[PDB]
UniProtKB/Swiss-Prot annotation, chain A:
This is NADH dehydrogenase [ubiquinone] 1 beta subcomplex subunit 5, mitochondrial. It comes from the Eukaryota. Accessory subunit of the mitochondrial membrane respiratory chain NADH dehydrogenase (Complex I), that is believed not to be involved in catalysis. Complex I functions in the transfer of electrons from NADH to the respiratory chain. The immediate electron acceptor for the enzyme is believed to be ubiquinone. Belongs to the complex I NDUFB5 subunit family. It comes from Bos taurus. It is found in: Mitochondrion inner membrane. Complex I is composed of 45 different subunits.
From Swiss-Prot, chain B:
Accessory subunit of the mitochondrial membrane respiratory chain NADH dehydrogenase (Complex I), that is believed not to be involved in catalysis. Complex I functions in the transfer of electrons from NADH to the respiratory chain. The immediate electron acceptor for the enzyme is believed to be ubiquinone. It comes from the Eukaryota. The chain holds residues 116 to 172 of 172 of the full protein. The keyword Transport applies. This is NADH dehydrogenase [ubiquinone] 1 alpha subcomplex subunit 8.
Length: 71, 57
């Protein structure tokens, strides 16, 4: 009789801790099933800036009437 | 009765007159084409933190 309430508890702490730390899982094992959804299969679209590769900067073009009309 | 154009000639870029239609929509100018959309969003921190293997925080 004087062992439990001196030391520990029953189905009020070790239950609903199982219900507690098993809600840190469905936002962990499911976001890890979105990286494979997105990173490996992005793929040919390249919409989200992960496969964004630099090509050229069009700022350095010129527009003056350069001295040959047919160029 | 003509002029001796000493130095004023062959310089001083002018304008002439509007004679013909200006060729807008030039030689081909096919497309841009379209860009890809961006994200503005809202910078929140990590949802539970770094989610790597066990790695709580």
């Amino acid at each position: 009789r004087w062992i439990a309430r001196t030391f520990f508890d029953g189905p009020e702490k070790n239950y609903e801790r199982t219900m507690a730390i098993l809600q840190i899982e469905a936002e962990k094992a499911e976001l890890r099933l979105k990286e494979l959804e997105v990173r490996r299969l992005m793929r040919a679209r390249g919409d989200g800036p992960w496969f964004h590769y630099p090509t050229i900067d069009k700022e350095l073009i010129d527009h003056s009437p350069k001295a040959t009309p047919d160029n | 009765g003509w002029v001796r154009p000493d130095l004023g000639d062959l310089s001083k870029v002018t304008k002439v007159k509007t004679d013909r239609p200006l060729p807008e929509n030039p030689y081909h100018s096919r497309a841009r084409p379209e860009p890809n959309p961006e994200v503005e969003g809202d910078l929140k921190p990590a949802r539970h933190g770094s989610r790597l293997f066990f790695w709580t925080m």
